[PDB]
Curated annotation (Swiss-Prot):
Function summary: GTPase component of the Pelota-HBS1L complex, a complex that recognizes stalled ribosomes and triggers the No-Go Decay (NGD) pathway. The Pelota-HBS1L complex recognizes ribosomes stalled at the 3' end of an mRNA and engages stalled ribosomes by destabilizing mRNA in the mRNA channel. Following mRNA extraction from stalled ribosomes by the SKI complex, the Pelota-HBS1L complex promotes recruitment of ABCE1, which drives the disassembly of stalled ribosomes, followed by degradation of damaged mRNAs as part of the NGD pathway.
Protein name: HBS1-like protein
Gene (name only): Hbs1l
Modified residues (Phosphoserine): S20, S70
Tissue: Detected in embryos.
Subunit and interaction comment: Component of the Pelota-HBS1L complex, also named Dom34-Hbs1 complex, composed of PELO and HBS1L. Interacts with the SKI complex.
Localization annotation: Cytoplasm
Gene source species: Mus musculus
Family: Belongs to the TRAFAC class translation factor GTPase superfamily. Classic translation factor GTPase family.
């Protein structure tokens, strides 16, 4: 957390995501949130929609189902319009 990776230069050195797996694993905290969120949006879109889609949406608003949904909804609703 504290004193880790910051600044432009730093990133450069790092060169691409140092570790993917780790990142993926995500911090237990976030994870609990992601899952606690995904699950939700899951029972909604998850029905047919996969996880990634939802997962992204979440990361699309740094964990914000309320938004991820409002967006995940307008995303599909976009198709059917006008008449």
């Amino acid at each position: 957390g504290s004193s880790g990776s910051s600044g432009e230069y730093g990133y450069e050195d790092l060169r691409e995501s140092s570790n993917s797996l780790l990142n993926h694993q995500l911090s237990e905290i976030d994870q609990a949130r992601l899952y606690s969120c995904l699950d939700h949006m899951r029972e909604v879109l998850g029905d047919a929609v996969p996880d990634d889609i939802l997962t992204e949406a979440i990361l699309k608003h740094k964990f914000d189902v309320q938004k991820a949904l409002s967006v995940v909804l307008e995303q599909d609703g976009s198709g059917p319009s006008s008449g």
